[PDB]
Amino acid sequence: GNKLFNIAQRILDTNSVLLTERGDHIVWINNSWKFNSEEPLITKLILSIRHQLPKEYSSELLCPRKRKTVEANIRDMLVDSVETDTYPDKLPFKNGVLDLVDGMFYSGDDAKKYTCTVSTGFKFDDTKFVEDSPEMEELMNIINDIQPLTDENKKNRELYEKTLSSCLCGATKGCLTFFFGETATGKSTTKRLLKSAIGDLFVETGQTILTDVLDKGPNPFIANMHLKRSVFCSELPDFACSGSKKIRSDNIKKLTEPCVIGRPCFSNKINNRNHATIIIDTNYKPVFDRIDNALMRRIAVVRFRTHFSQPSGREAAENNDAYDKVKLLDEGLDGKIQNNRYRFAFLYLLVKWYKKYHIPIMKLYPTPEEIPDFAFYL
Amino acid sequence: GNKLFNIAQRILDTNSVLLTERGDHIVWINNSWKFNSEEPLITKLILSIRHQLPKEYSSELLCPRKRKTVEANIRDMLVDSVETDTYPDKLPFKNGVLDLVDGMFYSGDDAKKYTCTVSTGFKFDDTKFVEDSPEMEELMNIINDIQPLTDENKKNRELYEKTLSSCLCGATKGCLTFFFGETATGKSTTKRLLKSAIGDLFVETFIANMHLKRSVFCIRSDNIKKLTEPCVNRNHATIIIDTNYKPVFDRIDNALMRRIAVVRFRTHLDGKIQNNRYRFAFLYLLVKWYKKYHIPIMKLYPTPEEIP
Amino acid sequence: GNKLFNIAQRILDTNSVLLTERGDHIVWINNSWKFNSEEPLITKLILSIRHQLPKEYSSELLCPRKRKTVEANIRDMLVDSVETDTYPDKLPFKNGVLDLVDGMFYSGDDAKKYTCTVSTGFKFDDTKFVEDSPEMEELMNIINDIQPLTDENKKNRELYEKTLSSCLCGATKGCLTFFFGETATGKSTTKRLLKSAIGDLFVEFIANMHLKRSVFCSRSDNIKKLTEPCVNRNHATIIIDLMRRIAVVRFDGKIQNNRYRFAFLYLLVKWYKKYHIPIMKLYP
Amino acid sequence: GNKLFNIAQRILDTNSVLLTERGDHIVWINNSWKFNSEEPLITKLILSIRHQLPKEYSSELLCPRKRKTVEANIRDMLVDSVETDTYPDKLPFKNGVLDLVDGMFYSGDDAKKYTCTVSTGFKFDDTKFVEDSPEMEELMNIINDIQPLTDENKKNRELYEKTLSSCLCGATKGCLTFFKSTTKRLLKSAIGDLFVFIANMHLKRSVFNIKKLTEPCRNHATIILMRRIAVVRDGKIQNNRYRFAFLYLLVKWYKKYHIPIMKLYP
Amino acid sequence: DGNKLFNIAQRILDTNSVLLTERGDHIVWINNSWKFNSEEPLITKLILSIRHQLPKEYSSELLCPRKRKTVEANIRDMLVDSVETDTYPDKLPFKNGVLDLVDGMFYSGDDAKKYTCTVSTGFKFDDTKFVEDSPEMEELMNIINDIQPLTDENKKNRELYEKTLSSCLCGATKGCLTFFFGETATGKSTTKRLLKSAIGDLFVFIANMHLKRSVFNIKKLTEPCVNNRNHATIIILMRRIAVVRFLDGKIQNNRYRFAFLYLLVKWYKKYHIPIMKLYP
Amino acid sequence: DGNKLFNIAQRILDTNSVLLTERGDHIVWINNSWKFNSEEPLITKLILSIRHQLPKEYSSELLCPRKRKTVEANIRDMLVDSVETDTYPDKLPFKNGVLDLVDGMFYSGDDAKKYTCTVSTGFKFDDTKFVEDSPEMEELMNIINDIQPLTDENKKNRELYEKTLSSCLCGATKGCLTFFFGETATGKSTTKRLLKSAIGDLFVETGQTILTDVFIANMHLKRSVFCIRSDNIKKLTEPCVNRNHATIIIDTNYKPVFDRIDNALMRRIAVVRFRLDGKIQNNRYRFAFLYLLVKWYKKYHIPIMKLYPTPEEIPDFAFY
């Protein structure tokens, strides 16, 4: 046959081009599963892959019109589509895919079989993934104080560990773990450590999602939710005042199934995989809209009881209600978080939590006994 | 005559490409009737069918400029349109078509005379479609407790049976069946089983996506009129709605009460359902109900006597 | 001259392609005047007509690029436009055109001079167009019981006859005949009978109403606008279930089986040929 | 030079293609100034004019690709535009132009210098344009009994006559004469499509807010502050029985009232 | 050497006949007018119409439409930077040239090219009717005198109306909303008709007012750029309002068009030589 | 060896004249400016213009318009990754180069090429009018003194006004909604016109519709916007809305009233207090004002740049 068909066969045997059910080809350049709808980037792959075909097959993929022939041949040999982001226990970094079951990191060609589209945004190295480092203790002390390692603070410790660890897995989690506690207790600190550790797979949302109906109109926070592995719901308003809505029971139902029932911007097909770990940051008594016996199996809560106070107002925090210990916040601590000093240390700690709590199976168990709003059905 | 016309004639002789009234050519690839509007995939069929033509004809369907010529020849020989999805008593699965009258499953070419466009989405296998498998009681328990087979609950039981079994037949059904009863009774569970059983032929609420969807899960006196005709986007839906309160209408007339049906729920696992454990068991149960209640003629009889 | 111009001239000499005032070419394929705006189906006709040209002319309408040169020539040789649907007393069936003045049926080429665009949708056959047939009496009894044939019910019967016969002719009729009466008295069954009889020329509303021959509706300005030759030509017979524009009349499983479809066709043709031979007109 | 430029020059030398201010090239086919915007019809003219060029030039205006080269040349040689519909005293028929000053009808090429785009829609013939005919009095008596020829009914008679006669001239007239259906039908039969709302209105000579309808800009209609308003107090018609007789009467009214200057006094 | 189709493009560009505008549309110079077309760039018309100037071998090949689009592409790939149109304010563009106001010399032809003026009055210009002495200039002077008396009482009003009319020729942005108070049938309509006959096309709603120099909310109409440049003198916060206080068929025949134009040019060159302005 | 057109494309690539942006358009380097267009990729203009640098045999064939599209396609198939633009916040782009706010050095030509700046002021720059001493300098700072008296009482207002005015040059996201409380005919319009003259194209005039409704496409990379819903306050603070490099300025005359007031909104509002035009349009004080702004920036924003809200003066809240 012609050379321009053998070339399109060989480029297809490397499985560099794949077809998705959404109708868009995904190519593999610069060690990343890239895809674009505005411009099909198959000719870029055909040009870049020529350093692997034999001499005569490489000395001819230089004319721009012998590359569109090859692209046209390729587009006529991809009949069946394949699905993306199937492996849930993989963390995609800008230069590879990191395993969770044993911590091995695959980089380059090896990190290709796991068809992962989204990425964290930053690179990876083993120089800061070390078990022992000064930063290891510089976060061990903060973790110990942010959640005391006492027998009274034992259930909360393990529940908080599980909730933070479930932020790396790429699967659907049915739970809306709550973050009960006052301000200056550590909610913002954890919110920034988590963002530094996971990067792009983290979206800070408002209270609009929990008090609206997700059926009509543009749905940006259902659109950009696509394949995100974390959603944070801080700045929650007060419920005792008038005009503040309640926690919509239907919304909780729509955030616990392995494919959220929503539509993209001006689209019709329903395919928006929900992998987020919806974490709600609270300050007051959370009151729901309508309570039924099939709802408490989707709600869990943890409590923070360590007050951070500068000497400006330190002497007025030791006499508070829900605090076992009162600590101080460092001046450059937040800037140190923005400096990504402990990004890899926090990543390592999360990996250890994952391989200590989620090796056999993954599950989040609701804890409705702590929350006393129900108070009627138990 | 040139060879690129003989190739087009031979490709047309296999009845692989068809023209529809909507103006889009449907092709038959990988044992499925596919069709696309943004890009007509006739060239994919032309390339994939080259293994059936003789040697000289096959050795030239490799140039992308000699395949667009064959596509242009094919498009100039399809003058008359062909209607699709005519058989109402068929269930299209991702790898064939299942008959409901007799239960035989056709896979591959034999499932080709039925031009079925939509499909359930998932595959089909006879291993889990067996009559005898311990899941029979494991589903019959819930089916019995949701609707006891007592003499008091006899009309409601059979009416709900007919309403659920009608979800498989892909025709036009005039009925607005309701789910009167209290919450936490099991209606959500039945919705879960139904979604797991029929799959893609099920939407949750909108006139574009209703295209030959065989079941819709959800008062204007005209909307019911607009949802009870052979053509509203063909209408194959079984529009079924859950209610918790005493239903009321806008205006009531004698020519409307023959379009309303009601079931009563009075009988106050989910993760297991999401595992589709009873998917094939529920499919077999629905097939049995359909072949017990809808063999000669398929129809839905409204009951306006119960609704006050 | 070149061969591809002689071929275009011969194709034009058969009067197969016509240009309409709307700007869309109409072609004659499969005994039907087809036309499409999103895609011009002239090359389909060029390919199909190749059996009539001589050997050398036929053996080269097989290249897709030589069937576009011929189409480009044809599109340049059509200068003046023609109007369609000029005959009002013709019924276009999916396989021909039926005359109303005498009832003799044209199938094939002979039903080509009358440029008919729309069609009834279904086929036609004279086997069920017979005079003596059970279905004829099994429908005659319904016609009698719906409208009694009494001296008291004399004017009403003939007015209903004229109103029903008026739905066949393809012209603009000035009338808005009403169907006053109680429910379940005969309006719905007659509506179903007419729908089964005439087919797609029947809509139960300015775009799809174009060229339709019957509209049912089961503002004086609206009456004024719906009485003119061009409101999208208007050929319908508006029936609803300034005085000189309004008329009134005073009043199931087998029907969609079309048991009496051809019987109803014969009945309507008989009424038309007994009531509208010299001139068709509906007096309010 | 090449042949495809000489052919374009010769086609241009016949003044068959013209460029208008609206941006569309009007062409002259079948004794009619046709123009289209969706599909420019210049290739039709190039094909239909080949019977006038010499043998060798004509023998090559048959390839569709050689008829687009000539059109490309022609579109590039047409630099300056020409204004259409300037003569107001000419009435265009589907097969020519009728003059109002003396009644002579020009057919074919003679009706080419007057660049008339719109048309009445129906053909013209002198057989029914005869002064003496049964239809002449069959319509004259209708004219008498719709407007009596009495001394009291004399001023209003001539106002009505002049208002009807102003409908033929293709100029701008600022007047809103206030009115009968028989006259409307007769006028619609007489002038055809030039009788009818800002698109199809263009260059219409008859329509059945004060200032917007009394200005030069095009408006050629006859609408039917105190110096702009005036007041004036079946099946055979659709058979076009008196169409040409009414046209003759209207033309006589024109070249008896509006010979030197055409004007409407409120 | 290089191909002929690049030398031809270079020669055509050397004549400064094609220019690029900030709006993204090329403007060409044909028939002594700066034409421009956006739906279809008319560079090929200029390329064909200019072939009489190049040498014989170059000229004998701008006859193939395929060779007149290679030259057009080359020209489009050699114009990098844009140019600004309608810069000179003291000019009047007539259908056959540009007329200067500070000295009265009329430029027609190639000499009237450096002033990139797009809009035009729409009518031709001649010097036969532009003579100082003629029956028409008194036939208009008496009308001017009776419309506005030349008395000491009506002197300030006369001068204000004078500056108002003389400002209509300048091609710049003028901040003023001069009023025309008075009774009807006194001369306002007559003056409007004379101005329409004098300036024609430049006399007329934010698109059609582009570069218009006359027209028959205060802040937006007294600023240089409303991109639609505004050069009109509006004719119907206190430092922006002024006021003045108070045969047709012959005017429609443009009997006094050139007499009015001569009047206006002397009018301007007597009131707006050093710097033009309008004092409210 | 391979075809000449691929070698030409590679050589044009090695000079780093074409760059691919994340928005999907290619920016090109012509006439000492990063030009980019969407309706027509202007890479062929660059291919024709750069031909003076390639060898003789390579330059003798970038004349056919069909050979400048092969090279364009080759170039488009070798730009795989994207490069971000307008990264340096302490740079002022002028029509003929870039100016460094750190020390006042001006780069003209290729040296102002590493800082990929797409937007520009629109007017040329000359060091002749950038002189420290000039009559216009006094004719300007006298107006500067009378608009804001140099007294101890009017000290905080003076420095806040200077900081707000100097922030107009920094190319970063400024989180603040500084108000301009004062009467009319006090000099506020003079300040607006002076800013427009000084920065030129990096300045827009918005209406009050934005502040009262739930004008964004053209707001991209503008360094100054001139003009109450609470949501819009956070909508104009985050880094990206279309990047947001503007310092939003609101003109008011009366007592401002907010829609819904909370404790987290006071940290986004500042305030300044106010207590020849043809010359401004003449752009006489353009460079004097530019020098004053650069001096203020060099005096107040050396290590970092930040805007501190001052809700103590504004009496609307008055409860928390």
Side-chain angles (χ1 to χ4, degrees), chain C residues 141-196:
Chain C
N141 60 355
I142 312 154
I143 296 313
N144 287 270
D145 60 51
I146 291 291
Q147 277 287 295
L149 187 40
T150 81
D151 277 296
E152 182 268 338
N153 209 303
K154 179 60 123 163
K155 175 266 303 172
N156 208 58
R157 173 68 180 269
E158 88 90 33
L159 183 121
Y160 175 77
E161 288 196 351
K162 214 178 281 324
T163 321
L164 261 188
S165 148
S166 70
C167 329
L168 303 181
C169 95
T172 289
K173 289 91 53 178
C175 40
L176 268 80
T177 57
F178 274 102
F179 266 7
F180 223 137
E182 267 165 50
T183 84
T185 325
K187 308 161 315 297
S188 192
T189 175
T190 57
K191 191 201 80 50
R192 285 181 290 273
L193 279 149
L194 186 69
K195 162 88 180 53
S196 62

Side-chain angles (χ1 to χ4, degrees), chain F residues 155-178:
Chain F
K155 185 261 290 181
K156 293 275 303 285
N157 216 49
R158 178 61 179 263
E159 54 95 3
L160 289 203
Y161 167 89
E162 276 195 351
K163 269 160 171 336
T164 294
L165 265 207
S166 97
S167 77
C168 261
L169 322 178
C170 214
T173 300
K174 276 88 70 164
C176 185
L177 273 311
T178 319

Side-chain angles (χ1 to χ4, degrees), chain A residues 64, chain F residues 5-6 8-9 12 43 47 61-62 66-76:
Chain F
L5 298 160
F6 202 67
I8 293 171
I12 291 171
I43 312 187
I47 296 176
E61 76 160 72
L62 300 167
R66 335 286 174 213
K67 293 178 163 175
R68 286 189 256 125
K69 307 207 85 67
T70 297
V71 185
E72 187 214 39
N74 273 319
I75 278 175
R76 293 173 86 102

